[PDB]
C-alpha cells in the first residue's frame, strides 16, 4: 500500500489497537502493509522510532486543548489541557505507555514553549509554572496508565471492596476530575501566597 509517513502512522495506530504496545512489532507492521521487512525498514528503522512518531501524532491528531483560549484563566487552561491530554492518551490501546517512551519533539517545541510562557505571563516563576504543568502531566499520565496497564494484567476487606466498586463504576473520570481540582486549588493557594508563610 502507500508508505508515505501519514499512511505508515495510520497503519501503526490501527496495529497498536489490535496488539497493544508490547505486541506491536515492525514484522507485524510490514504484514499489515503487504510489504517485506526490508521495504518497511527504508521507511521505519525500528520500534523505538515508530513509538516516538506515534506519541507525537497521537497529540497532533487528538489533543486539541494544547493552547489556552484568548483571555482564558491559567486555572481554566490547566483544567481543559489536562482533560484534553487524558482523552488523547485514552484514544489508543496503551496510549499512556506510548506517550511515556518519547521525546518532547521538535514539532511540539513551540506548543510546550507557549504553555510555559502563558504560565509566566500569569504570575508564575518559570520554576513554579513548570512544577504546575509537570504535576498536572504526571497526575494525568498516572491515572490514564493505571486503567490501561490494569486491563493488560487481566488479559476482600469491606472498604477496599466498596472502593474497587467505586473506582470501577466510571473509568476513573470522577476520581481524575476531583484530583484535578484539588491540584489546581493547591497551585492557586501557592501562587497567591507570594512570600507569606502558608
Ligand X SMILES: CN(C)[C@@H]1C(O)=C(C(N)=O)C(=O)[C@@]2(O)C(O)=C3C(=O)c4c(O)ccc(Cl)c4[C@@](C)(O)[C@H]3C[C@@H]12
What gap in Å lies between CA 70 and CA 114, rounded to an integer?
Answer: 13
If 0-12 CB within 10 Å is exposed, 13-18 middle and 19+ buried, where does residue 12 land?
Answer: buried
**4 lies in the binding site for Cl ion (CB under 5 A):** yes
Q: Is 69 in the site for ligand X (CB under 6 A)?
A: no
Minimum CB separation of residue 124 from Cl ion in Å reads 16
Q: Say if CB 57 and CB 105 are below 8 A apart.
A: no
To ligand X, the closest distance from the beta carbon of 10 in angstroms equals: 21
What is the full DSSP assignment across 148-173? Answer: HHHHHHH---HHHHHHHHHHTTTTSH
Question: Which of 60, 67, 83, 102 contacts a copy of itself by CB under 8 A?
Answer: 102
CB of 164 to ligand X, least distance (A): 6
Binding mask 148-187 toward ligand X (x if CB under 6 A, else -) reads ------------x--xx--x--------------------
Q: How far apart, in whole angstroms, are the C-alpha atoms of residue 63 and residue 174?
A: 20
Indicate the annotated binding residues for tetracycline.
63, 81
Indicate the annotated binding residues for Mg(2+).
99
Amino acid at each position: 500500500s502507500r508508505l508515505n509517513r501519514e499512511s505508515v502512522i495510520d497503519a501503526a495506530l490501527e496495529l497498536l489497537n489490535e496488539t497493544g504496545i508490547d505486541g506491536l512489532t515492525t514484522r507485524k507492521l510490514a504484514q499489515k502493509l503487504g510489504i517485506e521487512q526490508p521495504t518497511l525498514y527504508w521507511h521505519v528503522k525500528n520500534k523505538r522510532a515508530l513509538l516516538d512518531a506515534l506519541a507525537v501524532e497521537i497529540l497532533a491528531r487528538h489533543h486539541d486543548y494544547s493552547l489556552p483560549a484568548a483571555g482564558e484563566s491559567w486555572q481554566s487552561f490547566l483544567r481543559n489541557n489536562a482533560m484534553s491530554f487524558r482523552r488523547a492518551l485514552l484514544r489508543y490501546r496503551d496510549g499512556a505507555k506510548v506517550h511515556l517512551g518519547a521525546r518532547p519533539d521538535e514539532k511540539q517545541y513551540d506548543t510546550v514553549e507557549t504553555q510555559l510562557r502563558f504560565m509566566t505571563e500569569n504570575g508564575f516563576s518559570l520554576r513554579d509554572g513548570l512544577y504546575a504543568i509537570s504535576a498536572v502531566s504526571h497526575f494525568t499520565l498516572g491515572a490514564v496508565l493505571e486503567q490501561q496497564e490494569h486491563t493488560a494484567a487481566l488479559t476482600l476487606p469491606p472498604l477496599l471492596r466498596e472502593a474497587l466498586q467505586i473506582m470501577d463504576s466510571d473509568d476513573g473520570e470522577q476520581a481524575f476530575l476531583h484530583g484535578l481540582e484539588s491540584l489546581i486549588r493547591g497551585f492557586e493557594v501557592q501562587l497567591t501566597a507570594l512570600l507569606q508563610i502558608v
